[PDB]
Amino acid sequence: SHYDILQAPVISEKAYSAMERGVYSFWVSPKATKTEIKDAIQQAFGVRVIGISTMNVPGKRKRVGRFIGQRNDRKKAIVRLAEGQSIEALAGQ
Amino acid sequence: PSAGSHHNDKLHFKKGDTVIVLSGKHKGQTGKVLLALPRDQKVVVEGVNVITKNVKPSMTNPQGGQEQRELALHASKVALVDPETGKATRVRKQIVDGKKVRVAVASGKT
Amino acid sequence: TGKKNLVVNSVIRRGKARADGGVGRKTTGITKRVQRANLHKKAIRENGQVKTVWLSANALRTLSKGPYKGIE
Amino acid sequence: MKPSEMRNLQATDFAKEIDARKKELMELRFQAAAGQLAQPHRVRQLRREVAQLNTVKAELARKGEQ
RNA sequence: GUAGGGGAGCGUUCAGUCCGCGGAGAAGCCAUACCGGAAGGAGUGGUGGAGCCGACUGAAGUGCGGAUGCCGGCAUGAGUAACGAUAAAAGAAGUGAGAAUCUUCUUCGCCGUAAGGACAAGGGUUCCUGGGGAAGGGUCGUCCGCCCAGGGAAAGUCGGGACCUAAGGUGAGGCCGAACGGCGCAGCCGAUGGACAGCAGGUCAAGAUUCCUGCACCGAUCAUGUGGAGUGAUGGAGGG
RNA sequence: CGAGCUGGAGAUACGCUUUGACUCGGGGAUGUCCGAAUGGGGAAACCCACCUCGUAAGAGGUAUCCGCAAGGAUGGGAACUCAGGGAACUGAAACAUCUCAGUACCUGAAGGAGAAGAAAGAGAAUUCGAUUCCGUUAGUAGCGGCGAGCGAACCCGGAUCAGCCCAAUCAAGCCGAAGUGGCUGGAAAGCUACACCUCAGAAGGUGAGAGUCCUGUAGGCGAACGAGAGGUCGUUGUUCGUGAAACGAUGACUGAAUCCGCGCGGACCACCGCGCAAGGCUAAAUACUCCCAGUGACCGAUAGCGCAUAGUACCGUGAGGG
Ligand SMILES: [Mg+2]
Ligand SMILES: [Mg+2]
Ligand SMILES: [Mg+2]
Ligand SMILES: [Mg+2]
Numbered sequence: 001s002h003y004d005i006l007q008a009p010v011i012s013e014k015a016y017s018a019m020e021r022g023v024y025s026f027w028v029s030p031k032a033t034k035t036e037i038k039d040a041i042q043q044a045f046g047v048r049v050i051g052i053s054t055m056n057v058p059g060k061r062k063r064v065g066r067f068i069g070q071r072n073d074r075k076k077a078i079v080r081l082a083e084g085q086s087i088e089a090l091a092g093q
Numbered sequence: 094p095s096a097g098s099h100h101n102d103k104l105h106f107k108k109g110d111t112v113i114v115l116s117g118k119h120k121g122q123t124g125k126v127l128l129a130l131p132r133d134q135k136v137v138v139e140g141v142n143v144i145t146k147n148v149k150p151s152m153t154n155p156q157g158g159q160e161q162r163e164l165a166l167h168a169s170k171v172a173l174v175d176p177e178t179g180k181a182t183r184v185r186k187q188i189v190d191g192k193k194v195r196v197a198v199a200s201g202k203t
Numbered sequence: 204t205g206k207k208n209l210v211v212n213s214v215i216r217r218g219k220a221r222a223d224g225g226v227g228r229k230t231t232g233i234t235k236r237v238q239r240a241n242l243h244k245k246a247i248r249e250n251g252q253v254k255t256v257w258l259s260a261n262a263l264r265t266l267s268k269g270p271y272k273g274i275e
Numbered sequence: 276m277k278p279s280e281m282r283n284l285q286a287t288d289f290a291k292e293i294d295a296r297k298k299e300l301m302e303l304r305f306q307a308a309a310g311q312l313a314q315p316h317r318v319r320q321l322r323r324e325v326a327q328l329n330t331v332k333a334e335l336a337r338k339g340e341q
Numbered sequence: 342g343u344a345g346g347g348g349a350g351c352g353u354u355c356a357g358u359c360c361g362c363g364g365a366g367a368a369g370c371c372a373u374a375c376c377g378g379a380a381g382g383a384g385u386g387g388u389g390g391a392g393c394c395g396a397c398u399g400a401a402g403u404g405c406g407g408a409u410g411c412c413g414g415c416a417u418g419a420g421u422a423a424c425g426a427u428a429a430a431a432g433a434a435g436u437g438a439g440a441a442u443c444u445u446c447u448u449c450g451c452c453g454u455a456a457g458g459a460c461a462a463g464g465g466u467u468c469c470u471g472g473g474g475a476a477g478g479g480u481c482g483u484c485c486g487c488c489c490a491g492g493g494a495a496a497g498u499c500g501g502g503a504c505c506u507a508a509g510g511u512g513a514g515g516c517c518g519a520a521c522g523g524c525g526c527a528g529c530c531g532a533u534g535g536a537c538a539g540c541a542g543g544u545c546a547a548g549a550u551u552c553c554u555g556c557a558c559c560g561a562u563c564a565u566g567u568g569g570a571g572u573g574a575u576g577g578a579g580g581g
Numbered sequence: 582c583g584a585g586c587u588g589g590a591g592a593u594a595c596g597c598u599u600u601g602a603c604u605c606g607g608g609g610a611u612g613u614c615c616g617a618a619u620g621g622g623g624a625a626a627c628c629c630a631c632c633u634c635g636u637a638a639g640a641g642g643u644a645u646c647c648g649c650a651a652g653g654a655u656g657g658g659a660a661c662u663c664a665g666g667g668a669a670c671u672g673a674a675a676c677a678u679c680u681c682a683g684u685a686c687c688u689g690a691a692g693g694a695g696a697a698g699a700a701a702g703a704g705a706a707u708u709c710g711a712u713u714c715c716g717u718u719a720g721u722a723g724c725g726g727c728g729a730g731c732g733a734a735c736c737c738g739g740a741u742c743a744g745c746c747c748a749a750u751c752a753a754g755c756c757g758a759a760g761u762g763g764c765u766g767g768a769a770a771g772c773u774a775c776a777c778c779u780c781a782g783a784a785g786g787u788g789a790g791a792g793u794c795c796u797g798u799a800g801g802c803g804a805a806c807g808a809g810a811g812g813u814c815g816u817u818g819u820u821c822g823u824g825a826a827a828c829g830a831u832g833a834c835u836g837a838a839u840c841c842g843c844g845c846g847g848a849c850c851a852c853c854g855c856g857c858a859a860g861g862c863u864a865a866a867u868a869c870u871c872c873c874a875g876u877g878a879c880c881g882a883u884a885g886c887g888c889a890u891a892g893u894a895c896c897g898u899g900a901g902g903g
Contacts, residue, residue: 001638003297008308012492014545021553025495031613039637044298053495053551060466063489066894078495078552090305094889099786100796102604107584117768117788129585134786134795168787168795178761179794185756192599194583194755204518211519212665213832214816219678219823231823232726233678238667240519241815241832260833290638316595326611333610 005032005040009090010076016093022085023078030056030075037077045087051080097134104131105172105182110203114140115171115179123174128165135165175202205243205259207271213241248275281331289332296321296328 009015010025018025028037038049059071081087106112108129114122119140128137143164149157171179175198184197196203204210218235221228245257248266250273258266265271284292300321306312 001294001297003294003301006301008304011308014492014547017545018552023552044301051552055495055551057494058466061489068894076495080552093309097786098796103796104584105795109584115794116770131585171794181759181794183757192583192601210832213519217816217823226825233822236678239816243832261835264836312595314595316597319596330610337610 002040002043005029005037006044006077010078018078019091019093023080024087024091025076025078028054028075028077030073032075034077038079041077041079047081047085047087049079050082053078097130097132100134100168102132104129104134104136105168106136110173112136112138112170112172113174113179114138114166114169116169117166127163130165134167136167136170137163137165138170139163140170141166173203175200204257205262206256206273207262207265208259210259211240211242213239215239248273250274277327281327282335289328293325293328296325300325 006026006028008027010027012025015025024041026041028040032040034052034054037054038052041047041049054075054077057074057076059073060069061072062069106126106129108126110126111123112126114120114124122138122140124139126136126138128135130136141164143162145160145162147156147158147160149155172182173196174180180198182196182198184201185194186197187193187195195201216235216237216239217233218237219231219233221231223231243259244263246263247255248258249256254273256273266273266275300318303312303318303321307318312318
């Protein structure tokens with residue numbers, strides 16, 4: 001359903017300054033396509049998406065321990081809203 | 094690697110009990126059980142006191158100092174106490190508490 | 204593979220010299236012992252509905268007498 | 276939470292209870308991302324809660340329609 | 342006294358039986374001028390820190406200097422050969438525990454149909470930022486393509502798929518074959534070819550025909566108006 | 582079950598627990614995507630569809646082969662079983678028949694086993710009475726470039742045992758007896774002095790060596806509900822190599838008798854004797870060891886499995902090697 005899909009928001013210095021222009025970034029399910037991703041944001045936040053762009057992201061670490069490591073694997077969706085922007089209070093952060 | 098399996102992940106006592114240290118240093122010494130680890134066969138009694146050197150870096154103030162704290166034991170303390178000295182366990186019953194088996198001896202109080 | 208009774212199974216080809224005579228020359232020494240196969244033939248016959256199945260010779264005979272489950 | 280006081284609810288009153296937790300679970304997921312999870316136990320609790328609703332909605336589906 | 346034959350025994354592990362020993366110090370290790378005809382065996386001291394001699398009998402994975410023997414460790418060659426294109430370098434200033442080697446300034450020199458720039462393949466985070474300084478770097482590093490943490494990758498129009506077919510592959514039915522299987526029309530798969538709508542700029546530390554700004558274009562669905570009747574396959578032809 | 586728990590993880594935080602956590606039994610309900618893989622495609626784990634119900638979310642369906650359908654089948658198994666196919670090195674001190682060997686390998690089918698099985702038999706007693714397996718007969722009889730070498734069966738002794746239908750107790754678990762003082766020592770289960778249990782002195786742990794300190798042992802108890810035809814040519818099988826070579830089996834060609842009938846008894850004929858083919862099914866003893874338990878004059882870190890755990894690192898395009 002709605003409330004799943006968008007796992008976490010994108011932290012970073014670039015997402016916070018993208019916020020300041022009504023552009024929101026989220027880490028979503030890598031299988032959750034643009035239309036499904038559009039709907040999920042639209043409902044859960046009560047706002048219309050005028051544009052959506054997204055892209056899949058790889059992993060790969062280890063600090064020590066001969067455990068060669070392994071990936072993590074994401075998808076990052078970035079949306080723009082019509083003139084009356086903002087999302088909750090989780091935008092001013 | 095093995096460990097605390099030799100017994101049966103079964104302690105011969107509870108974390109409430111008063112127990113006497115049978116064997117080692119701290120002989121006969123009595124104390125309230127504060128931590129019982131059945132699998133590891135560990136007991137924390139107000140008896141074995143040690144000074145633990147506190148390796149403290151930037152971890153909320155430097156103050157790298159020494160600490161007074163209790164160091165856990167095995168089966169080197171006997172299964173509860175009543176006639177003042179160390180004991181075993183035998184005569185099971187149930188008072189107003191039917192859903193409980195008690196532990197007795199060459200007497201009958203725990 | 205004859206529809207009625209499967210076939211093609213076969214064995215070796217011995218070929219001796221000092222070959223045939225008065226019961227005993229010296230004897231009959233072998234010079235061969237290989238490994239060979241043997242087969243049959245085919246035609247078009249049916250039962251129930253339409254079929255064109257492979258038919259043996261001693262199957263074409265067994266049919267040009269009394270029909271067994273499948274006709275002509 | 277767990278006994279008979281859970282099965283009284285109707286049809287959409289079961290899908291409702293799930294949705295309210297999934298939403299809370301997501302608010303906590305976002306809270307985790309912005310270093311604000313003081314109560315991590317709340318996370319498993321709701322996951323145990325949603326599981327219970329989903330388990331029961333299957334018990335009652337067979338304790339009627341057989 | 343070589344091949345060889347015969348005899349008597351020493352030693353190791355395991356077992357059974359007996360006798361014992363040991364944290365007031367077992368085995369193992371180390372030193373030793375003592376003993377026995379040899380294999381060998383004791384005493385003492387030192388080290389170790391928990392097991393173990395002696396005797397009788399039984400059994401063996403039972404004794405090593407060799408096999409260009411196997412595994413491992415360590416020597417010699419020797420502070421030797423080298424340090425991977427003869428395209429240079431110099432100084433000043435900075436940083437730092439430490440500087441020929443890191444940063445900055447000014448020169449110098451080398452490439453310039455390349456030793457510049459843009460892809461594809463392939464690689465897989467090597468990209469940017471902050472930090473590190475064991476190993477890797479043929480030297481040194483305060484630096485790095487190395488080590489740690491965080492971030493970065495944005496498409497209706499670009500390339501591929503939701504379109505097309507080539508070689509080839511596969512292939513209901515169909516043709517063969519001891520089995521496994523081999524073929525094979527249509528169809529289907531298969532780009533390296535066909536087809537098809539977006540141009541100019543701006544700018545993160547790190548993306549840009551992808552984001553932002555300016556103005557376009559394409560298909561679909563629907564609302565409005567004009568039109569006032571046709572639309573025109575799985576098939577034909579032209580065209581590609 | 583009776584107080585702990587919050588997986589190895591040893592790490593902080595949050596917490597959960599006698600309104601019985603945790604762990605142990607035993608059943609359910611979830612169970613993405615790939616894989617027989619099964620909608621179609623595909624360079625596994627991805628791409629693209631249609632149908633039906635449905636409030637969108639979401640749920641179900643869409644492979645081929647048997648059969649009215651019910652219902653079955655595809656794929657996977659270490660070894661063991663049967664079947665289709667079937668080597669060479671090697672031995673013969675050369676080599677070709679012969680041997681290695683119907684072994685190795687491939688392929689098919691299947692199961693906890695399979696195979697085989699109910700006399701047209703064995704063999705010479707007018708004895709036996711389906712099969713398999715073990716002993717033995719016996720390196721006998723026999724085969725054999727009569728060379729290398731290969732090698733039965735009946736009798737008898739055992740394991741197990743039957744023949745039947747067609748066609749005209751075991752795991753979860755609970756209960757469980759009896760030692761204290763001095764000494765040596767960092768520490769006592771060793772030493773010492775007195776004692777005790779024993780249907781229990783098997784063993785593990787506990788600062789060193791444990792009957793009586795813990796877990797246990799002998800003994801007993803223990804479940805919701807969970808397990809228990811003849812012929813000819815070609816060839817071959819078994820001791821069977823064309824031999825005096827019967828009998829089985831069968832690719833080609835032929836193709837009988839019906840109970841004063843038919844098959845066999847090692848060319849063949851007579852006589853005597855043993856059997857009823859051309860239809861099916863069938864426990865048990867036997868083989869194996871992925872897994873489990875118990876044990877060992879088995880190993881104890883160059884040993885023992887390749888691994889005190891890794892099929893990893895590493896090598897290779899790959900099979901594969903490690
Ligand atoms: Mg040597
Ligand atoms: Mg073709
Ligand atoms: Mg060692
Ligand atoms: Mg392994």
